[PDB]
Symmetry: D2
Subunit: 116 residues, 4 copies
């Protein structure tokens, strides 16, 4: 599991459950190509997006559908989604944990990168 995403709700002090996200990888022609997708579990985590073999060097974008999340709670949020764009595996394979903390008008995102 070289890529895991964890989403928290700062309003309810809970994991953010059933949050959809799409991962994209930049192709040689500079377009974003679909790479993987999924929804967070009860712990607010999404595991198993990719494998070490498949997760090659490149520029990746994680689009977290924060807007649908807030909507289903009755909240009309500011952002369309939270975006995280980064170069991966530039110096060799790493494990990446992307954490996102959500409020209706704010979000923060951090990465934990560890050497396999």
């Amino acid at each position: 599991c070289p890529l895991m995403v964890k989403v928290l709700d700062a309003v309810r002090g809970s994991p953010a459950i059933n949050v959809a996200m799409h991962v994209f990888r930049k192709a040689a022609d500079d377009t974003w190509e679909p790479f993987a997708s999924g929804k967070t579990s009860e712990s607010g985590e999404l595991h198993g997006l990719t494998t070490e073999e498949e997760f090659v060097e490149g520029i990746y974008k994680v689009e977290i559908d924060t807007k649908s999340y807030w909507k289903a709670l009755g909240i009309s949020p500011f952002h369309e989604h939270a975006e995280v764009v980064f170069t991966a595996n530039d110096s060799g394979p790493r494990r990446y944990t992307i954490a996102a903390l959500l409020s209706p008008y704010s979000y923060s995102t951090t990465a934990v990168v560890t050497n396999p």
Copy 2:
């Protein structure tokens, strides 16, 4: 000044100065059309991006070049840039301030929407 952006540096505790950014507006074919751009001032602020006549309802993306900012400081950053994507919605009388707080491996952004 319907839209202003403020950027802060969490490593040095200062405004983030000379940060470049581009603002895009979502087009009907779902591509991003450039709309406005600039560099943050000494106060870390970017003013005069648009006018209220021009700033109509729609989806907007602010793309902040955080990577070049950290490179200039000699610090290896995680993100390619920081993106803030939002819908502008008439309410009516409203001004938008988008604040970003930057660290090498983290960023946070908030909107202050007033009248």
Copy 3:
């Protein structure tokens, strides 16, 4: 204005208005002596807490009553308050802005220190 505090509301995307806070200065017996206090304005800012003659080096604590703020909005908060504890250090010419961004179960604070 050597020290100013700004508070923002991440749930409503606005300044946090009428937030009460107290500033303490660490005494030699390691207890906190009240120093200054006030309520945030309509811009979510608290100015005029101290003067530069009075604002000498030392350890300071700003205690922001976030709990009363969320109670007034009908939202059950996690924190009793938000505390920012820092050392003021001559550098020399410096102004301090302490910003806090509040959510019911989270807060973030940053210092912008300029000249």
Copy 4:
């Protein structure tokens, strides 16, 4: 484990390791009494601070020694420490995860509260 604290470093994109913290509980005379203490592990986590029996209703303060952390990395930070003060177990036993994200001039803290 009704109380766990997790500390992350936003400058290095890593867990914040060997970070000291002290926990205090407000006594009936309004003073802060020592409750528990420890240092974060290699995963940036501190487990086993307390037990369900011992962790009664009350107002608790977690003082995270962020200043020593930054110092040992050669950084002169803004804050003396990060403080988290909260009422616990007011409606019955809960499990609390306190997360703290650190930069030299900034920190954020969030709580995840789950019903046992």
